[PDB]
Write a protein that binds this ligand. Structure first.
Ligand code: GD
Ligand code: GD
Length: 110
């Protein structure tokens, strides 16, 4: 879940006020302050917006794609600026940051 919250009480909803609730439990904790949105460009042309943290593993990222799109992780390979992404590494390992684009290609074995 994501929503705007008027933290500062300007009365004017601002860009630095998009908050992201990863757990979907109604709140943002200290860890979710670092949450971000990344984009995943698929082959159907559809672009998926993902809610992630820099500590998320690529395997987690793939699990989230399945929640949203129904695609099994075994069928998923992710690419970021050339480097294909290893399941056990994190978004931070690859220096994947807010509003980065990942490419989702089709995994074929052998
Ligand atoms: Gd504000
Ligand atoms: Gd939360």
């Amino acid at each position: 879940g994501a929503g705007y919250i008027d933290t500062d009480n300007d009365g004017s909803i601002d860009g630095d006020e998009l908050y992201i609730d990863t757990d979907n439990d109604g709140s943002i904790d200290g860890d979710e302050l670092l949450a971000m949105q990344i984009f995943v460009k698929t082959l159907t042309g559809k672009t998926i917006t993902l809610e992630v943290e820099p500590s998320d593993t690529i395997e987690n990222v793939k699990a989230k794609i399945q929640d949203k799109e129904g695609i099994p992780p075994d069928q998923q390979r992710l690419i970021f600026a050339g480097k294909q992404l290893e399941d056990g590494r994190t978004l931070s390992d690859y220096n994947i940051q807010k509003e980065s684009t990942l490419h989702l290609v089709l995994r074929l074995r052998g």
